[PDB]
Design a protein around this ligand. Structure first.
Ligand SMILES: *C(=O)N1C[C@H](NOS(=O)(=O)O)CC[C@H]1C(=O)NC1CCNCC1
Length: 361
């Protein structure tokens, strides 16, 4: 009855949304009572007929920020940086710029003062162009006052955490972070030998779409991973104490809330809500205006533990993909939903919420 019931519940949550959004392929992984459960739907590639499995690689877009946060959490534990450091402390090129007056925490939590959603199209994947971009940038408003969701913001945070560790960001993820987390199906640059696992992404008129190079891509949106590996990452988040101390502490650092905007508490990478909360409120927290518009923050008196009866989540998209991850620390429950179409966040959250509410019922 239990396996039948879980299958029935996940099918009932996924299938209508998959169909309504014409999603070619979709992978679900659920961590429940200390055990993983995988559900795979449809096609990784419509053209060659490869089916989705729990090992299929999907682009996870902005979910990458949680890995980026974990690297920064590590740097914090290596006493290599502090959240209250000025950004320019970690890149001499920034000394004398406005980044003298902006903290690593401001950068990590999108409150640096109006850094935009993306780098302008004129900024290529080029260290000098990136450096020059930040040198010339001026805040629209005071640092620490307004949240404006931003790839350049947390991208810089990740880049400076890597600088504090004395190695390139990409090398650190591949050589240290992913191995420390036990992740062998998680990549910034998918190896040729693994390309057969990499799903095709689909956009309008089913044009094929995979993510191309961009400035600070690895930091903001560049990770490709499987449902099985992303769930392993969720289980690491549920049980940091199962890893060696330095990496336990790194994960813990991403479970700390610094301010609220409406129902959402902003951590490093992770965004948190009280649990339970209505589907409509969770949808609103992950809505377009939350990503695209500035919001005045309500700063907490002290960092808040993001644990117990809370839902921690992150959405992520690329041109061709749509990912969502959610977990409830106090219930030892986690879920991953990866699709090879960018479909609205509200729809991803709807699937997740249907699964979570069915599990409690
Ligand atoms: C994350 O997936 N990003 C950044 C931002 N996230 O807002 S959210 O509510 O979707 O998580 C916007 C979309 C996405 C992003 O950076 N997409 C880019 C499209 C163009 N190619 C580079 C990735």
């Amino acid at each position: 009855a239990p396996a039948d019931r879980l299958k029935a519940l996940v099918d009932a949550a996924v299938q209508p949304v998959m169909k309504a959004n014409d999603i070619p392929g979709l992978a679900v992984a659920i961590s429940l009572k200390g055990e993983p459960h995988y559900f795979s739907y449809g096609l990784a590639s419509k053209e060659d007929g490869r089916r989705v499995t729990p090992e299929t690689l999907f682009e996870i877009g902005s979910v990458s920020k949680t890995f980026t946060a974990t690297l920064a959490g590590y740097a914090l534990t290596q006493d290599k940086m502090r959240l209250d450091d000025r950004a320019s402390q970690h890149w001499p090129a920034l000394q004398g710029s406005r980044f003298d007056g902006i903290s690593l925490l401001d950068l990590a939590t999108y409150t640096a003062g109006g850094l935009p959603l993306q780098f302008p199209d004129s900024v290529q994947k080029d260290q000098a162009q990136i450096r020059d971009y930040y040198r010339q940038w001026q805040p629209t408003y005071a640092p620490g006052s307004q949240r404006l969701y931003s790839n350049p913001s947390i991208g810089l945070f990740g880049y400076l955490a890597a600088r504090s560790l004395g190695q390139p960001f990409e090398r650190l993820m591949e050589q240290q972070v992913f191995p420390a987390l036990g992740l062998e199906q998680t990549h910034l640059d998918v190896p040729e030998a693994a390309l057969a696992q990499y799903a095709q992404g689909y956009g309008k008129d089913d044009r094929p779409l995979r993510v191309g190079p961009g400035p600070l891509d690895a930091e903001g949106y560049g990770v490709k991973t499987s449902a099985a590996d992303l769930l392993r990452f969720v289980d690491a988040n549920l049980h940091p104490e199962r890893l060696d101390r330095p990496w336990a502490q790194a994960l813990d650092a991403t479970h700390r809330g610094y301010y609220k905007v409406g129902d959402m508490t902003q951590g490093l990478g992770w965004e948190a809500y009280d649990w339970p909360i209505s589907l409509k409120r969770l949808q609103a927290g992950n809505s377009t205006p939350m990503a695209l518009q500035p919001h005045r923050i309500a700063r907490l008196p002290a960092p808040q533990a993001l644990e117990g009866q809370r839902l921690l989540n992150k959405t992520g998209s690329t041109n061709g993909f749509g990912a969502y991850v959610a977990f409830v620390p106090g219930r030892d429950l986690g879920l991953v939903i990866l699709a090879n179409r960018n479909y609205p966040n509200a729809e991803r959250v709807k699937i997740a919420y249907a699964i979570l509410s069915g599990l409690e019922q």
